[PDB]
Design a protein around this ligand. Structure first.
Ligand code: BEF
Ligand SMILES: [Mg+2]
Length: 115
Protein backbone atom coordinates (compact mmCIF):
# COMPACT_ATOMS: atom_id res chain seq x y z
CA UNK A 1 0.00 0.00 0.00
CA UNK A 2 1.16 3.51 -0.88
CA UNK A 3 0.29 6.59 1.15
CA UNK A 4 -0.27 10.06 -0.34
CA UNK A 5 -0.61 13.32 1.57
CA UNK A 6 -3.13 15.58 -0.23
CA UNK A 7 -2.85 19.29 0.67
CA UNK A 8 -5.50 21.77 -0.43
CA UNK A 9 -7.28 24.63 1.39
CA UNK A 10 -10.64 23.93 -0.22
CA UNK A 11 -12.47 21.18 1.70
CA UNK A 12 -14.66 20.06 -1.23
CA UNK A 13 -11.56 19.74 -3.40
CA UNK A 14 -9.73 17.74 -0.70
CA UNK A 15 -12.78 15.44 -0.67
CA UNK A 16 -12.86 15.09 -4.46
CA UNK A 17 -9.13 14.37 -4.70
CA UNK A 18 -9.30 11.85 -1.83
CA UNK A 19 -12.13 9.99 -3.56
CA UNK A 20 -10.41 9.95 -6.94
CA UNK A 21 -7.11 8.72 -5.51
CA UNK A 22 -8.76 6.08 -3.24
CA UNK A 23 -10.34 4.71 -6.43
CA UNK A 24 -6.80 4.07 -7.72
CA UNK A 25 -6.09 2.10 -4.56
CA UNK A 26 -4.03 4.58 -2.54
CA UNK A 27 -4.29 5.45 1.14
CA UNK A 28 -5.01 9.15 1.49
CA UNK A 29 -4.34 11.61 4.31
CA UNK A 30 -5.20 15.30 3.95
CA UNK A 31 -4.07 18.68 5.25
CA UNK A 32 -5.91 22.01 5.00
CA UNK A 33 -2.93 24.37 4.89
CA UNK A 34 0.85 24.49 4.41
CA UNK A 35 1.77 24.61 8.07
CA UNK A 36 -0.35 21.50 8.79
CA UNK A 37 1.15 19.86 5.69
CA UNK A 38 4.71 20.30 6.92
CA UNK A 39 3.83 18.95 10.36
CA UNK A 40 2.12 15.86 8.98
CA UNK A 41 4.75 15.31 6.33
CA UNK A 42 7.85 15.42 8.56
CA UNK A 43 6.14 13.39 11.33
CA UNK A 44 4.78 10.84 8.86
CA UNK A 45 5.92 8.42 6.20
CA UNK A 46 4.34 9.39 2.88
CA UNK A 47 5.27 8.09 -0.54
CA UNK A 48 4.03 11.22 -2.31
CA UNK A 49 2.75 14.65 -1.43
CA UNK A 50 0.29 16.48 -3.68
CA UNK A 51 0.37 20.24 -2.97
CA UNK A 52 -2.04 23.01 -3.80
CA UNK A 53 -0.33 26.36 -4.29
CA UNK A 54 -2.88 28.99 -3.22
CA UNK A 55 -3.67 28.61 0.49
CA UNK A 56 -4.16 30.91 3.45
CA UNK A 57 -0.75 31.19 5.11
CA UNK A 58 2.38 29.82 3.42
CA UNK A 59 1.93 28.88 -0.24
CA UNK A 60 2.36 25.38 -1.63
CA UNK A 61 5.47 26.65 -3.46
CA UNK A 62 6.95 27.50 -0.05
CA UNK A 63 5.87 24.09 1.31
CA UNK A 64 7.46 22.32 -1.71
CA UNK A 65 10.76 24.14 -1.06
CA UNK A 66 10.84 23.06 2.59
CA UNK A 67 10.00 19.45 1.85
CA UNK A 68 12.58 19.23 -0.91
CA UNK A 69 15.29 20.67 1.38
CA UNK A 70 14.53 18.31 4.31
CA UNK A 71 13.60 15.18 2.35
CA UNK A 72 15.90 15.05 -0.67
CA UNK A 73 14.19 12.08 -2.34
CA UNK A 74 10.58 13.27 -1.68
CA UNK A 75 8.03 12.83 -4.47
CA UNK A 76 6.12 16.09 -4.89
CA UNK A 77 3.34 17.08 -7.32
CA UNK A 78 2.12 20.70 -7.45
CA UNK A 79 -1.63 20.45 -8.22
CA UNK A 80 -3.14 23.90 -8.71
CA UNK A 81 -6.09 25.45 -10.50
CA UNK A 82 -3.69 27.93 -12.16
CA UNK A 83 -1.07 27.60 -14.90
CA UNK A 84 0.51 30.89 -13.72
CA UNK A 85 3.09 29.28 -11.45
CA UNK A 86 4.46 26.71 -13.91
CA UNK A 87 7.38 28.94 -14.94
CA UNK A 88 8.03 30.10 -11.32
CA UNK A 89 11.56 29.35 -10.13
CA UNK A 90 10.14 27.84 -6.93
CA UNK A 91 8.22 25.19 -8.91
CA UNK A 92 11.57 23.43 -9.60
CA UNK A 93 11.22 21.97 -6.07
CA UNK A 94 8.44 19.71 -7.44
CA UNK A 95 8.74 16.58 -9.54
CA UNK A 96 5.60 17.44 -11.51
CA UNK A 97 3.23 20.33 -12.03
CA UNK A 98 -0.41 19.56 -12.85
CA UNK A 99 -3.20 22.06 -13.54
CA UNK A 100 -6.44 20.81 -11.95
CA UNK A 101 -8.85 19.24 -14.46
CA UNK A 102 -12.27 17.56 -14.06
CA UNK A 103 -10.72 14.64 -16.02
CA UNK A 104 -8.40 13.07 -13.45
CA UNK A 105 -6.61 10.75 -15.89
CA UNK A 106 -3.59 13.10 -16.25
CA UNK A 107 -3.15 13.49 -12.46
CA UNK A 108 -3.47 9.73 -11.99
CA UNK A 109 -0.87 9.00 -14.69
CA UNK A 110 1.64 11.37 -13.06
CA UNK A 111 0.97 9.92 -9.59
CA UNK A 112 1.42 6.35 -10.94
CA UNK A 113 4.68 7.47 -12.65
CA UNK A 114 6.20 8.95 -9.48
CA UNK A 115 5.29 5.98 -7.32
F1 BEF B 1 -5.48 26.94 -4.59
BE1 BEF B 1 -4.56 25.90 -5.56
F2 BEF B 1 -3.20 26.67 -6.20
F3 BEF B 1 -5.55 25.49 -6.88
MG1 LIG C 1 -6.05 26.62 -2.88
Amino acid sequence: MKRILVVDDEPNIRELLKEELQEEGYEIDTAENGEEALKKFFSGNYDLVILDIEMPGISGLEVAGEIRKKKKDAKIILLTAYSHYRSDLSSWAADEYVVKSFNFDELKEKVKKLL
